[PDB]
Design a protein around this nucleic acid. Structure first.
Length: 104
DNA sequence: GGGTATTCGCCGCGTACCTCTCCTAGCCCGCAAGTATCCTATTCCTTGCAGCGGT
């Protein structure tokens, strides 16, 4: 009863939360099979494309993201360094917690 | 077509600092400088025409 196409490779967190919340209703969840990728391939296949771009081979990831029209939302420890704001890691965690709890 | 092997081409290979050197090639057109040449004088000689005393 989910929406994912048959052969999609989807982030584990998205599918886990979608199934977990759907079962609260009368829907049947999706079935997934975990996959292992070497780090060099794992860091590139990330939701936040600035993290990938700062890593190796910017050209490929950047063109692919541009075509797909992605939209990065600045949650890692690296893109927040690039933009120049507090990290959501150490003392800045309280600030980011309040920031989330205010806008939302 | 189809499963397979083989080849081609792209991607990647540590951080921080110190000293030194060198950074387009070739054409072209105005232009400064330096020079050989050409016109400018002086002195000698032998003509050609206009005044001019003289009768």
């Amino acid at each position: 009863s989910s929406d994912f196409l048959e052969g999609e490779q989807v982030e584990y967190s998205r599918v886990k939360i979608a199934n977990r919340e759907l079962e609260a209703n009368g829907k049947v969840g999706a079935t997934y099979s975990r996959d292992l990728l070497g780090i060099t391939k794992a860091s590139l296949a990330t939701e936040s494309f600035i993290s990938a771009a700062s890593f190796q081979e910017t050209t490929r990831v950047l063109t692919e993201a541009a075509v797909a029209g992605k939209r990065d939302e600045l949650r890692g420890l690296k893109e927040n360094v690039i933009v120049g704001r507090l990290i959501p890691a150490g003392t800045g965690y309280a600030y980011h917690q309040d920031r989330m709890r205010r806008r939302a």
